[PDB]
Design a protein around this ligand. Structure first.
Ligand SMILES: Cc1cc(C#Cc2ccc(CN3CCOCC3)cc2)ccc1C(=O)NC[C@H]1C[C@@H](NC(=O)[C@@H]2C[C@H](F)CN2)CN1C(=O)C1CC1
Ligand SMILES: [Zn+2]
Length: 297
């Protein structure tokens, strides 16, 4: 059967919050069967734990935030993206501050740290949300859709009226294309005028060319350029994969975004969860006949 997984070993990492500019210590801990992903603010007494679930999403403007009372965890989507892509079911994520560290702007450092520690298969069936009906949400020119699909896949389109925008569409079937190789290294990005404005509103305090593609009116200012010709849309897919993991189970289906972001992705999640006719929970007694597959642990 397809079994739940956690970490084989605890993983420690250090970085800065994109928005806060704060130094943060991250610890990823193994977790029991059916824990899910749970963020832990260990700088607080008592410790505040927020399950990484749709119902615990806050503001959503700058990034994906988990909230419980007046406590938040900012910018969860790249780490959730990394765990989603390695099929981690159960893990405690401990943080010494309000924000997940941005690392290089991509999921790559998180996927490396996780795969170094290795995965542990657990004696319990992995549960899948299978998309049964199309579920779409729109607002203005943005749209986000679930479509039934015997596998897992993400299609995304963006349309910046900007000299840098290279391919603005991409589609990845993750049963036949490597999340690790093709998506995980895709870095977040910021336009210079936006960055200047957010800096002035005491936002983007951790930002640098070390953790973001910085774009002026014409070009990438990052000296060493891009990791993929289509890095911007690839990063949009990475963000979506992170947000999709707030469903609390792995997806069998296809996601399609058209200029979508954290707010519309969240509306899609709530709309899916609410329309119980559109999805079922499945398990797989036989991996060999399953529509999705996983790397050896
Ligand atoms: C990445 C970033 C970086 C900086 C920054 C910065 C910065 C600040 C200062 C410097 C220069 N300094 C650094 C210190 O040394 C001196 C020079 C460089 C960069 C400031 C803002 C952002 C930003 O929010 N970009 C949003 C981008 C990325 C994407 N979304 C994501 O990826 C989601 C959200 C979050 F982003 C992580 N997941 C969708 N998207 C957009 O559609 C934008 C057009 C709206
Ligand atoms: Zn991102």
């Amino acid at each position: 059967m397809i079994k739940q997984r956690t970490l084989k070993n605890i993983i420690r990492a250090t970085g800065v919050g994109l928005h806060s500019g704060e130094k943060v210590y991250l610890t990823l801990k193994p977790a029991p069967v059916d824990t899910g992903i749970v963020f832990s603010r260990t700088d607080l007494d008592p410790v505040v734990e927020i399950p990484a679930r749709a119902e615990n999403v806050g503001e959503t403007t700058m990034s994906t935030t988990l909230v419980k009372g007046d406590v938040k965890v900012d910018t969860v989507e790249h780490l959730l993206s990394a765990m989603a892509g390695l099929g981690i079911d159960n893990a405690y994520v401990e943080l010494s501050a309000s924000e997940v560290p941005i690392m290089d702007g991509s999921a790559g450092p998180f996927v490396f740290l996780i795969q170094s520690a290795g995965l542990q298969e657990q004696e319990a069936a992995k549960k899948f949300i299978r998309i049964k009906r199309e579920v779409s949400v729109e607002e203005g020119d943005k749209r986000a859709v679930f479509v039934p699909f015997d596998g897992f896949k993400v299609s995304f389109e963006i349309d910046f009226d900007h000299p840098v925008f290279r391919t603005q569409q991409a589609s990845v079937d993750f049963s036949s294309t490597s999340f690790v190789k093709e998506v995980s290294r895709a870095r977040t990005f910021g336009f210079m005028r936006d960055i200047e404005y957010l800096r002035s509103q005491n936002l983007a305090l951790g930002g640098s060319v070390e953790n973001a593609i910085v774009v002026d009116e014409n070009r990438v200012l990052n000296e060493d350029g891009l990791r993929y010709e289509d890095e911007f849309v690839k990063h949009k897919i990475l963000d979506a994969i992170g947000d999709l993991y707030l469903l609390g189970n792995s997806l069998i289906g296809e996601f399609r975004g058209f200029k979508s972001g954290h707010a519309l992705n969240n509306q899609l999640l709530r709309t899916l969860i609410a329309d119980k006719d559109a999805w079922e929970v499945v398990t797989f007694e036989d991996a060999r006949t399953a529509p999705i597959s996983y790397m050896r642990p």
